[PDB]
Amino acid sequence: GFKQDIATLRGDLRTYAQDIFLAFLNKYPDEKRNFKNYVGKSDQELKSMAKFGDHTEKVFNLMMEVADRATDCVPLASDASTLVQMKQHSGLTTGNFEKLFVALVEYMRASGQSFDSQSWDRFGKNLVSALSSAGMK
Ligand code: MNR
Ligand SMILES: Oc1ccc(Br)cc1
């Protein structure tokens, strides 16, 4: 289920993080408006860029911590507020996060592994709701 998935993702996190974020960028190309330095690059070229690998894994490091601290796929209010207040997120809206989690859920469903895709869909929706409650437009 959800908790086992966190362990599975953590056991190969740099690869999962990059592959999921690439799925997001490729499914939603306009989202590169927030990633100007990732424009004009193929998947393999992005994977060679130091900040791409390091930032994506750090993003997913924390996403797993937020998932791990959640109850029934509902994140803590303190984690949601952290995500709203981060300066790195100053320009973002809940739709940016919804699209990330649509891509994450589709990635899991296209994989051959028994990911609990339904719980990750709940987690993404519940995260969006917590982000809105904590002030994100
Ligand atoms: C589509 C937009 C974005 C979505 C969705 C998103 C969703 C999430 C998310 C999901 C639950 C988590 C956990 C998360 C966490 C982070 N995030 Mn976030 N994020 N996020 C950015 C846009 C987005 N984030 C940007 C832009 C930056 C800073 C620039 C960069 O590192 O390229 C950043 C930065 C970061 C960093 C700092 C990385 C460092 O400096 O190396 C963490 C940690
Ligand atoms: O550098 C970044 C990579 C992926 C996300 Br999601 C946010 C920032």
Domain count, the chain: 1
Pairwise CA distance, residues 67 & 63, whole Å: 6
Q: Distance from the CA of 19 to the center of ligand 2, in angstroms?
A: 12
Pairwise CA distance, residues 132 & 53, whole Å: 29
C-beta of 20 in contact with ligand 2 (< 6 A): no
The tokens of 67 are what? 């998932």
Q: How many CA atoms lie within 13 A of 80 on its CB side?
A: 23
Domain limits for position 78 = 1-137
CA angle, corner 23, sides to 49 and 68, nearest 5? Answer: 90
Cβ count near 95 (within 10 Å): 13
Using an 8 Å Cβ cutoff, are 59 and 21 in contact? yes
Query: Residue 96: what residue type?
Result: N
Pairwise CA distance, residues 121 & 85, whole Å: 24
Residues sharing a CB contact under 8 Å with residue 48, sequence separation 6 or more, in sequence order: none
Q: How many CA atoms lie within 13 A of 54 on its CB side?
A: 3
C-beta of 21 in contact with ligand 2 (< 6 A): yes
**Residue 74 DSSP class:** B
Resolution for this experimental structure (Å): 1.9
